PDB file of C-alpha atoms in Angstrom:
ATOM      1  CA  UNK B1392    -118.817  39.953  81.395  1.00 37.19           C
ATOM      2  CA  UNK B1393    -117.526  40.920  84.525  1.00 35.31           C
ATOM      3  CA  UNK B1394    -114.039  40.251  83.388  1.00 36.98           C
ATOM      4  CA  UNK B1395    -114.904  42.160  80.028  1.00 38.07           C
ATOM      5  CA  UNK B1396    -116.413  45.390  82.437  1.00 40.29           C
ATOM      6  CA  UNK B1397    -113.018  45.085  84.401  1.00 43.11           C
ATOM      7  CA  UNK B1398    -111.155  44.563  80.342  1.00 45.17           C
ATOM      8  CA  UNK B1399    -112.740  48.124  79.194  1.00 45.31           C
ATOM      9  CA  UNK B1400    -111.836  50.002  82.171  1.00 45.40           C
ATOM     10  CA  UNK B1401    -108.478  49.215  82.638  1.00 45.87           C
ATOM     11  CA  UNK B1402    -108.439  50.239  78.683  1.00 48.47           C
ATOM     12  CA  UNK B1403    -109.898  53.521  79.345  1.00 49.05           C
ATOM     13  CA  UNK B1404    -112.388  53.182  76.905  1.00 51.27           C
ATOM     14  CA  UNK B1405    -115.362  50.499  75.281  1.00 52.37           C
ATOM     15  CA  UNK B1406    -114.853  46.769  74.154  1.00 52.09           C
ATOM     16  CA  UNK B1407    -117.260  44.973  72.155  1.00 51.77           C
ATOM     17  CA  UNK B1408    -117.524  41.404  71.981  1.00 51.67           C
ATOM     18  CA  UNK B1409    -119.770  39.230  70.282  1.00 49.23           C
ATOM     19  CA  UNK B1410    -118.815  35.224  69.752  1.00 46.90           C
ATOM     20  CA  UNK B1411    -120.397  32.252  68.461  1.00 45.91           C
ATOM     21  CA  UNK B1412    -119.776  28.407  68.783  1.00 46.77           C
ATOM     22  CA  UNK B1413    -121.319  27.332  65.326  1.00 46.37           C
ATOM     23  CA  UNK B1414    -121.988  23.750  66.877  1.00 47.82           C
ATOM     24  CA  UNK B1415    -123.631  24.280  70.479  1.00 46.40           C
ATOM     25  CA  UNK B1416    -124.954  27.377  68.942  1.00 45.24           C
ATOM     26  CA  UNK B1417    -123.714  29.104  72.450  1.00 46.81           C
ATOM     27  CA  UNK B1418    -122.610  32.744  72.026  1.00 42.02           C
ATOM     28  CA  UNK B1419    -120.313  35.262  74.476  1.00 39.43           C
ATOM     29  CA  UNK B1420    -122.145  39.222  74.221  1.00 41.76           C
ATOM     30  CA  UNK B1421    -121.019  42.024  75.440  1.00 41.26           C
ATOM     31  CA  UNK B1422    -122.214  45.686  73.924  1.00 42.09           C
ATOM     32  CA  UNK B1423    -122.483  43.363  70.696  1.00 42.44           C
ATOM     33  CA  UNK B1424    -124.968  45.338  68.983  1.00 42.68           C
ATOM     34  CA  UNK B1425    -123.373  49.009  70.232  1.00 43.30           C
ATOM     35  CA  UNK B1426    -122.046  50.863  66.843  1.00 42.43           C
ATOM     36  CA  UNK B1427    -117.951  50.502  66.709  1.00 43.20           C
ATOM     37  CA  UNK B1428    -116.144  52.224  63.721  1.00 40.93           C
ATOM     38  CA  UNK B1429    -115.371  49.645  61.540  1.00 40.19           C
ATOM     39  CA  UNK B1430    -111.923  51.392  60.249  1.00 40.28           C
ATOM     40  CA  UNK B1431    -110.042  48.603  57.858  1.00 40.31           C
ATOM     41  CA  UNK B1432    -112.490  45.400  58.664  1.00 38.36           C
ATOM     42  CA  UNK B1433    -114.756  46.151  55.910  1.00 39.05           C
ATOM     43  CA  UNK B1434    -112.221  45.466  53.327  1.00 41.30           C
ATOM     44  CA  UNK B1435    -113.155  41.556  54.215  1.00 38.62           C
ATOM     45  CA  UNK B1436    -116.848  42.369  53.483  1.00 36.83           C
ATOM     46  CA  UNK B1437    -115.739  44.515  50.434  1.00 34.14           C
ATOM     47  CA  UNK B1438    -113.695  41.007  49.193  1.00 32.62           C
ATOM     48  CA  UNK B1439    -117.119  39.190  49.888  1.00 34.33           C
ATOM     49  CA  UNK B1440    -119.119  41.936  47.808  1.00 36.67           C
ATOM     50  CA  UNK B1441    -116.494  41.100  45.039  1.00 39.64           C
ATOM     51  CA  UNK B1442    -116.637  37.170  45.421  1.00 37.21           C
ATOM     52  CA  UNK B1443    -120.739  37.321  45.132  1.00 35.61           C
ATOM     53  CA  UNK B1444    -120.555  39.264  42.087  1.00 36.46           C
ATOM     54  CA  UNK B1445    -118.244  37.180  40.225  1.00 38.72           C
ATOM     55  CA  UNK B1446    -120.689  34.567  40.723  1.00 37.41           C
ATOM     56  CA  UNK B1447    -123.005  35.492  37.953  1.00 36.24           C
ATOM     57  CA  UNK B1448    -119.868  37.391  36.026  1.00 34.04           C
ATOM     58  CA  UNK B1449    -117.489  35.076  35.032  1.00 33.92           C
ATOM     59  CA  UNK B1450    -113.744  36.249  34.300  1.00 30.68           C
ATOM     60  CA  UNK B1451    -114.333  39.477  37.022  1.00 29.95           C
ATOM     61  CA  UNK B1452    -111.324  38.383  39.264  1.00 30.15           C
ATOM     62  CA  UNK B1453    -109.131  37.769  36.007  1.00 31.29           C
ATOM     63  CA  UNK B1454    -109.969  41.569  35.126  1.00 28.65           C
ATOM     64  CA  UNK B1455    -106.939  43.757  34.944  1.00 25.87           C
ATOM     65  CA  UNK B1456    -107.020  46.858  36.590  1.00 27.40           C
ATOM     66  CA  UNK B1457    -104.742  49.754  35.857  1.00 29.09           C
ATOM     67  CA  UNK B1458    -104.472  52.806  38.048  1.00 31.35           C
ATOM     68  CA  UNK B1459    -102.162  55.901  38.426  1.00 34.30           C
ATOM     69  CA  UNK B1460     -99.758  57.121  41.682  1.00 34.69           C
ATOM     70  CA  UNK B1461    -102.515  59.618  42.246  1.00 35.79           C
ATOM     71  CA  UNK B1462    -104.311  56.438  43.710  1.00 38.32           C
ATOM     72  CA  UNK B1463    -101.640  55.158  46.241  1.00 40.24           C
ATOM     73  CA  UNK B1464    -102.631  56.749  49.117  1.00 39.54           C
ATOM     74  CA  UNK B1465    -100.966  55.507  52.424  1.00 39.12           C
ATOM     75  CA  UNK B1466    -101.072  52.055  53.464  1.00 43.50           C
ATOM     76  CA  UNK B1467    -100.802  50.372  49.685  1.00 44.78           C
ATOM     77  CA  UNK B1468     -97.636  48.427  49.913  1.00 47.01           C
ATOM     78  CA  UNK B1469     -99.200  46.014  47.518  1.00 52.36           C
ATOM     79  CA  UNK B1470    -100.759  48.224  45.187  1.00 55.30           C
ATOM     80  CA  UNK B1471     -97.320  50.627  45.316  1.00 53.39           C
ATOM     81  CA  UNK B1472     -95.116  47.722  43.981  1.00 56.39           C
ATOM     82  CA  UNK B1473     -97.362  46.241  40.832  1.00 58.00           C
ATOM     83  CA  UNK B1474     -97.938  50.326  39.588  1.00 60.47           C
ATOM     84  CA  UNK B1475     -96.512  49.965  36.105  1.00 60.44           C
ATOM     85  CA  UNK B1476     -98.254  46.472  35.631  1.00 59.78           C
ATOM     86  CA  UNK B1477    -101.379  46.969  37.099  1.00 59.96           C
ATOM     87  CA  UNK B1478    -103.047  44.033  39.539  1.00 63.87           C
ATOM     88  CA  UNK B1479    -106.488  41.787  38.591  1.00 64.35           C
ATOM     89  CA  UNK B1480    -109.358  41.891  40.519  1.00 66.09           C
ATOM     90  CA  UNK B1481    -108.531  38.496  42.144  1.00 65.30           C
ATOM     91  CA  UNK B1482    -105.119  40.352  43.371  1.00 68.51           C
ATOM     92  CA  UNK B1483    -106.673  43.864  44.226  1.00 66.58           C
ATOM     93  CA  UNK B1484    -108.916  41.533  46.722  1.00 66.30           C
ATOM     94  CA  UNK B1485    -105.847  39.529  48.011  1.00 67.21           C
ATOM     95  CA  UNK B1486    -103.432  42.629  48.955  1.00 68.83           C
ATOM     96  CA  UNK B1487    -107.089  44.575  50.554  1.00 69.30           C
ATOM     97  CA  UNK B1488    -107.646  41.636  52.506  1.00 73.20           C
ATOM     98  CA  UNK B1489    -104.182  39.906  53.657  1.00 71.62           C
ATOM     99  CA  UNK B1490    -102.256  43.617  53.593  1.00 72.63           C
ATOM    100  CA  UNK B1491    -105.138  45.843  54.142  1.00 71.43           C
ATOM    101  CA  UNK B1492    -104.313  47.895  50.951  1.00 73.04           C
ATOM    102  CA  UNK B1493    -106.262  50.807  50.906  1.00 77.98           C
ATOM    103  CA  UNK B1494    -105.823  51.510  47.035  1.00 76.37           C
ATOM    104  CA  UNK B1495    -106.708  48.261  46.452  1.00 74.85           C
ATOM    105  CA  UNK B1496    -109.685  48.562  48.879  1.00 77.98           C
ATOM    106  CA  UNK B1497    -110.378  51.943  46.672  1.00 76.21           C
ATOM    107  CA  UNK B1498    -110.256  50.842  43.455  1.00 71.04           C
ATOM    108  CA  UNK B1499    -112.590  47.834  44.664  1.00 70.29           C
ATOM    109  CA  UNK B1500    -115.215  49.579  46.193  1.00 69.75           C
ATOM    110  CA  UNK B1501    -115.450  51.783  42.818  1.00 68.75           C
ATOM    111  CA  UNK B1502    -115.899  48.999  41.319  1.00 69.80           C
ATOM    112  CA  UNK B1503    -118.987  47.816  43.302  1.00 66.02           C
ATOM    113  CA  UNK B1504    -120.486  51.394  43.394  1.00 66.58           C
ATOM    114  CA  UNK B1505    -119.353  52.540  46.480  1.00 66.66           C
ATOM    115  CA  UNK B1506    -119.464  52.681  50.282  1.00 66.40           C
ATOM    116  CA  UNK B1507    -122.813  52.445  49.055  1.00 63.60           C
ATOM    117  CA  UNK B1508    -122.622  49.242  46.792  1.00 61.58           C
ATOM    118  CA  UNK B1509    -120.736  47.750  49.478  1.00 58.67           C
ATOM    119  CA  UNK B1510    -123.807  48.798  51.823  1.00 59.54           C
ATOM    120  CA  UNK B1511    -125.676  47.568  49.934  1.00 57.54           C
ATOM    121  CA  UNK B1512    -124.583  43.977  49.475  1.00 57.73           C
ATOM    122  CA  UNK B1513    -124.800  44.120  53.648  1.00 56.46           C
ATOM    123  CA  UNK B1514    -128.178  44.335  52.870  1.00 56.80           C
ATOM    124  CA  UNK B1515    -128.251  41.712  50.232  1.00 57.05           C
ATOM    125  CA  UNK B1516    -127.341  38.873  52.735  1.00 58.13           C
ATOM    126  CA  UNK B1517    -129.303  40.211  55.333  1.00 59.80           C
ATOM    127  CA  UNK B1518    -127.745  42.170  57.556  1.00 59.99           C
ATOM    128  CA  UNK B1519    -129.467  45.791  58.501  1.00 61.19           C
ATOM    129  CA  UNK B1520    -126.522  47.304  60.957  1.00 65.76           C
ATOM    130  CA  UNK B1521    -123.627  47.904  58.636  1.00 66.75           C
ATOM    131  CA  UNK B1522    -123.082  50.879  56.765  1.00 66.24           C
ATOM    132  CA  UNK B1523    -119.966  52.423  55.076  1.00 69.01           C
ATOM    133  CA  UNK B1524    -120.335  56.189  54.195  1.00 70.71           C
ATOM    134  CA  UNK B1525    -116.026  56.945  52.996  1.00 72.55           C
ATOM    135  CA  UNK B1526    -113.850  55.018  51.562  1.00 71.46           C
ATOM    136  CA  UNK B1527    -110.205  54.893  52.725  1.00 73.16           C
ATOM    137  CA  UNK B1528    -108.959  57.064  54.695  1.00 79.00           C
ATOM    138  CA  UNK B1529    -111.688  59.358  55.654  1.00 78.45           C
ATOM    139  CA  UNK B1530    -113.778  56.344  56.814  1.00 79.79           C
ATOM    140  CA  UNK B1531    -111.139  56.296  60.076  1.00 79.79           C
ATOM    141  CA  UNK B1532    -112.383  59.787  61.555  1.00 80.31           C
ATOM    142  CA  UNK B1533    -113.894  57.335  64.427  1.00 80.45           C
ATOM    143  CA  UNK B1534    -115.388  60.097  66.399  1.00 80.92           C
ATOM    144  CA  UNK B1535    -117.616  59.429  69.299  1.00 76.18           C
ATOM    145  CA  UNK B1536    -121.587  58.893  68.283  1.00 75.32           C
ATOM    146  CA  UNK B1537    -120.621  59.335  64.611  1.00 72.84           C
ATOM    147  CA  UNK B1538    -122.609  56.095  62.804  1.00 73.25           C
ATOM    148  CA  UNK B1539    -120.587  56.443  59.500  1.00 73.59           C
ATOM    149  CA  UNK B1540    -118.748  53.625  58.766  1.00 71.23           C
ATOM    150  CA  UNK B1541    -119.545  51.525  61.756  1.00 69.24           C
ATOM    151  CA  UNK B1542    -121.530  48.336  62.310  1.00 73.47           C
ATOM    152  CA  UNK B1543    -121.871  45.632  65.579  1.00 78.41           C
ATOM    153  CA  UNK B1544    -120.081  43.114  66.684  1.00 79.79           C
ATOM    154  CA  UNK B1545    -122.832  40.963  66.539  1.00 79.36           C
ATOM    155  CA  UNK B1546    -123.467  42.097  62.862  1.00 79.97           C
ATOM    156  CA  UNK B1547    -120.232  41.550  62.145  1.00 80.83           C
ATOM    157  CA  UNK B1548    -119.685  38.597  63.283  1.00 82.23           C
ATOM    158  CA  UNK B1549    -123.450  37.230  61.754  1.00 80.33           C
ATOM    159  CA  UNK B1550    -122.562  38.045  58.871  1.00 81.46           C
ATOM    160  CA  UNK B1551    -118.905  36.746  58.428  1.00 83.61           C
ATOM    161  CA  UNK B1552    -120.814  33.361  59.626  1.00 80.87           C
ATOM    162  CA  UNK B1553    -122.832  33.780  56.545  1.00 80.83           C
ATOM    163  CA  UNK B1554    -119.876  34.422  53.679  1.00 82.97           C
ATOM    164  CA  UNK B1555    -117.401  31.844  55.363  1.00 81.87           C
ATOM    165  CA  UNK B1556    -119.495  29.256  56.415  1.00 83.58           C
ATOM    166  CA  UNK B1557    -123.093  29.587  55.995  1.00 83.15           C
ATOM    167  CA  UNK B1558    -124.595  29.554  52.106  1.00 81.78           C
ATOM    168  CA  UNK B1559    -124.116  33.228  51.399  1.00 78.10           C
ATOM    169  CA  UNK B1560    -121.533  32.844  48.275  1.00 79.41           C
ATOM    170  CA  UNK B1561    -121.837  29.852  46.470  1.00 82.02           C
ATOM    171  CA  UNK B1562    -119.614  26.791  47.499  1.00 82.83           C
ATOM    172  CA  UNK B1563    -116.181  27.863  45.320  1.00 79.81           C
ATOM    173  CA  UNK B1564    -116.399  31.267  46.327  1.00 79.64           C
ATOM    174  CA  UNK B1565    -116.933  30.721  49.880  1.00 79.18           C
ATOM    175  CA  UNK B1566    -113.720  28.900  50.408  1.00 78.50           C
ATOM    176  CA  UNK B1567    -111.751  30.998  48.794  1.00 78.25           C
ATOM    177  CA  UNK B1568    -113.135  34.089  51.266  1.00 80.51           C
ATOM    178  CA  UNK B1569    -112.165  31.896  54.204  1.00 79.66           C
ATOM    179  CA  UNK B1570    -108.699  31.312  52.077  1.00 84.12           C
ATOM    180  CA  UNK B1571    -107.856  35.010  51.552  1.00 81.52           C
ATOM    181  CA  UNK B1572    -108.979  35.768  55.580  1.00 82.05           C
ATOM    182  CA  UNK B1573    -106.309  32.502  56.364  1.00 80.85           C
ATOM    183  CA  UNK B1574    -103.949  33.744  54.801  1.00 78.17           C
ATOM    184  CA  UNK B1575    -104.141  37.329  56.720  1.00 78.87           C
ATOM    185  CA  UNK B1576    -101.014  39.079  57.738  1.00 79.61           C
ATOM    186  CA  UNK B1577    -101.983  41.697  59.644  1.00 80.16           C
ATOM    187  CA  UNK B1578    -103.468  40.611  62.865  1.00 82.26           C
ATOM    188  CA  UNK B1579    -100.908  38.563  64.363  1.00 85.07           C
ATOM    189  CA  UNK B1580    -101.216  40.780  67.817  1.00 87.18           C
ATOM    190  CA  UNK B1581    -104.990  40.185  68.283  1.00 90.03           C
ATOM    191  CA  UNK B1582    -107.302  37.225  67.549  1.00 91.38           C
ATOM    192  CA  UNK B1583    -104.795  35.387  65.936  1.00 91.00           C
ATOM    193  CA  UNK B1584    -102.992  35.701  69.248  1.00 91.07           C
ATOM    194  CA  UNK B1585    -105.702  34.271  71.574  1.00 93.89           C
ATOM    195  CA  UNK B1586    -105.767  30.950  70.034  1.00 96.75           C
ATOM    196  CA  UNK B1587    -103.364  27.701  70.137  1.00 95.65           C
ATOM    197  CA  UNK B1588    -101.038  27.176  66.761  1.00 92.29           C
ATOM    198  CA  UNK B1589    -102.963  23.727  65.218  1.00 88.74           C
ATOM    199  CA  UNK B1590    -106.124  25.837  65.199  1.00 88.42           C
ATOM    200  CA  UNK B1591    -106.651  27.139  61.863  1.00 89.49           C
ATOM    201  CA  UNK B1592    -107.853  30.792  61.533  1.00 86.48           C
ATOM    202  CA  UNK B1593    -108.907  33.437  59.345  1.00 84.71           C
ATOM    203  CA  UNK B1594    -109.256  37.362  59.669  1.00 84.67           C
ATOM    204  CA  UNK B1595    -109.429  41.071  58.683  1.00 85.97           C
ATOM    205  CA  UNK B1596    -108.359  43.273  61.297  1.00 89.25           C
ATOM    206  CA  UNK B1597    -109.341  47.343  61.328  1.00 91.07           C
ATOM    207  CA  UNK B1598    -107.096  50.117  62.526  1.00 89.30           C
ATOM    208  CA  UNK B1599    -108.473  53.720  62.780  1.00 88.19           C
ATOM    209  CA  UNK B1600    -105.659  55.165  64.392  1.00 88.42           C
ATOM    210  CA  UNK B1601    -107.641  57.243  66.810  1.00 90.73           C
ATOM    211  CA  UNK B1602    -109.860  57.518  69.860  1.00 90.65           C
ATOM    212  CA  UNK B1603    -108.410  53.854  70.568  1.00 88.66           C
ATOM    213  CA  UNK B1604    -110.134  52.532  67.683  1.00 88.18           C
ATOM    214  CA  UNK B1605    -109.312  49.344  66.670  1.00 90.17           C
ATOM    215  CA  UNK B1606    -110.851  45.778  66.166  1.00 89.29           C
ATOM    216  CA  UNK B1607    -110.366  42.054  64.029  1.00 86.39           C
ATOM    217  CA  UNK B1608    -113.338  39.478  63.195  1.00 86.60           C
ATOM    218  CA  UNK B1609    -112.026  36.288  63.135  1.00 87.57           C
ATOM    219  CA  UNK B1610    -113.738  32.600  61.947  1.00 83.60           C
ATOM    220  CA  UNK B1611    -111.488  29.858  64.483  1.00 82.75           C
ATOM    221  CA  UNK B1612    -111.393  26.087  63.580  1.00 79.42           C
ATOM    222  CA  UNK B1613    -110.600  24.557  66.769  1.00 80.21           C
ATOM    223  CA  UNK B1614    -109.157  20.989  66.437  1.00 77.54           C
ATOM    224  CA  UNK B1615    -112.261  18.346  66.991  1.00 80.52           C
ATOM    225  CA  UNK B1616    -114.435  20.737  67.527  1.00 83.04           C
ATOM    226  CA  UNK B1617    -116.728  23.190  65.057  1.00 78.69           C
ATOM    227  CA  UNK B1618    -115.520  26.478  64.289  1.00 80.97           C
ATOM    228  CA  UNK B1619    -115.938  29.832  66.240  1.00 81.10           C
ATOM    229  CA  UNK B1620    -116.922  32.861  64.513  1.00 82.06           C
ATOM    230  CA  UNK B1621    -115.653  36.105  66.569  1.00 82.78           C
ATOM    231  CA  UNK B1622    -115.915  39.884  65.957  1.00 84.08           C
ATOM    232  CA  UNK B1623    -113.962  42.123  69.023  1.00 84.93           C
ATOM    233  CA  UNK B1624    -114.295  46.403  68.471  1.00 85.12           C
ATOM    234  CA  UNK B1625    -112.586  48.819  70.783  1.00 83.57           C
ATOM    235  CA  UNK B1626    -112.744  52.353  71.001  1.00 83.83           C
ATOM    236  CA  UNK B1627    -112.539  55.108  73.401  1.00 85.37           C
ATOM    237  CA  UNK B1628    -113.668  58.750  74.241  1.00 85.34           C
ATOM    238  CA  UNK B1629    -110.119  60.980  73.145  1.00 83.84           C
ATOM    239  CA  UNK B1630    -108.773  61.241  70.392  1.00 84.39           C
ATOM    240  CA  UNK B1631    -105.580  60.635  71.400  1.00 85.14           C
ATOM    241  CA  UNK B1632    -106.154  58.008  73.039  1.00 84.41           C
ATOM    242  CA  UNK B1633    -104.353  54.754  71.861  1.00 84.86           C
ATOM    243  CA  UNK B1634    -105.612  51.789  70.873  1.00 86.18           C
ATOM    244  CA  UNK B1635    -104.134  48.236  71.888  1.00 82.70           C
ATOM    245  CA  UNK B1636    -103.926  44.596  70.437  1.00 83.31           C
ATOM    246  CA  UNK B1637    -103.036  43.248  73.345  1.00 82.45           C
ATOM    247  CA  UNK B1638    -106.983  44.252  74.696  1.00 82.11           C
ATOM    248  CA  UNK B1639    -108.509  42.884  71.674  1.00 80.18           C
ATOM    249  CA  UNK B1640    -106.211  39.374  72.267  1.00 78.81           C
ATOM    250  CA  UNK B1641    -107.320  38.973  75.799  1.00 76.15           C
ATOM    251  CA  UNK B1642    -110.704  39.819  75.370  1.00 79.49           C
ATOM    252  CA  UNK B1643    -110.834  37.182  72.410  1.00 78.14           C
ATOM    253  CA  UNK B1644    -109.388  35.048  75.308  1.00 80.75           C
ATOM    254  CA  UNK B1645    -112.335  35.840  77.202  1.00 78.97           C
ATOM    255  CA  UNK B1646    -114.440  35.161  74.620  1.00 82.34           C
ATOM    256  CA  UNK B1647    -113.350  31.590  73.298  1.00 82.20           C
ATOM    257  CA  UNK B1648    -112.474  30.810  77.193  1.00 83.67           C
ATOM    258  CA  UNK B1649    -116.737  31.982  77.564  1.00 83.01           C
ATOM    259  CA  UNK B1650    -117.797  29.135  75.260  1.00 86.98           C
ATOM    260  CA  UNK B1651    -115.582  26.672  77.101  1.00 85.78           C
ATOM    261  CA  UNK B1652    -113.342  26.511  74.149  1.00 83.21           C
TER     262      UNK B1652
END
């Protein structure tokens, strides 16, 4: 805590931290249940919304989607390259989640109503903080005291507990969740980067690109011991300023190092 005061300040801005050993049941909290933008992490969630739902619909994530160039918008490296052929549901969720493809995040949350239907399912499982108001990329405005679009670590981090490993989705669709997250290539530099290399890990990092505004959520299998579930936010009061990976990695560092792990 001290170390995560000390963290902040030499970052010029606010860290939020909020980490859970799912055996001891021991957590690490620090301004866990402030409000941090949530930028690109919701596109896990958004996967989630779209797991659930194919739960009692049957052939959703077989469901070919086709879109025009009006929807690439930057950021869809995935969605850019299958244009002419289209991409399923099942690979829409794949490139949002592993790339963080914002047409694919799009065209997803249109398909579950909304910021709102993806609100919404938030609610479903339980959890009252989260809200998304935009969809990609007005959601990254990340300006100070503005509550669109943001959630707590401590939400966060509750309720990826609840997809991955608790009984939120159903048994199939819970381990392929955890399967998309593992197979994440996009936050090398943060969580990912805190941890040893036999640990197994999964994650969906977020990226505003302003007022230091970054995070990643993170579910950690340490080896002989139950997993971790993680959430780390950053953000800070310019807009210029810059946000850092290498802040998010040591405070994860702080965080697994908290729970003796």
């Amino acid at each position: 805590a001290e170390p995560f005061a000390k963290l902040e300040q030499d970052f010029g801005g606010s860290i939020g931290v909020y980490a859970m050993d799912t055996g001891s049941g021991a957590t690490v909290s620090y301004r866990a249940e402030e409000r941090f933008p949530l930028c690109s992490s919701f596109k896990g969630f958004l996967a989630a919304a779209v797991l659930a739902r194919s739960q009692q619909q049957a052939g959703l994530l077989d469901t070919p989607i086709r879109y025009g160039k009006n929807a690439l918008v930057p950021w869809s490296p995935i969605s850019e390259k299958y244009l002419t052929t289209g991409m399923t549901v099942a690979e829409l969720s794949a490139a949002a989640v592993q790339y963080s493809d914002n047409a694919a995040a799009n065209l997803l949350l249109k398909e579950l109503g909304g910021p709102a239907g993806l609100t919404a399912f938030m609610r479903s499982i339980g959890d009252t903080t989260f809200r998304l108001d935009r969809w990609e990329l007005e959601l990254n405005s990340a300006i100070p005291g503005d509550a669109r679009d943001t959630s707590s670590p401590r939400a966060v981090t509750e309720s990826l507990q609840k997809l991955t490993l608790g009984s939120a989705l159903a048994a199939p669709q819970r381990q392929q969740f955890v399967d998309w997250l593992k197979g994440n290539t996009t936050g090398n530099h943060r969580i990912r980067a805190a941890v040893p290399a036999d640990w197994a890990v999964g994650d969906k990092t977020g990226t505003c690109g302003v007022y230091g505004t970054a995070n990643d959520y993170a579910v950690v299998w340490p080896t002989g011991r139950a997993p971790i579930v993680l959430a780390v936010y950053t953000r800070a009061p310019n807009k210029d300023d810059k946000h850092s990976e290498a802040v998010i990695a040591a405070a994860a560092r702080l965080a697994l190092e908290g729970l003796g792990v």
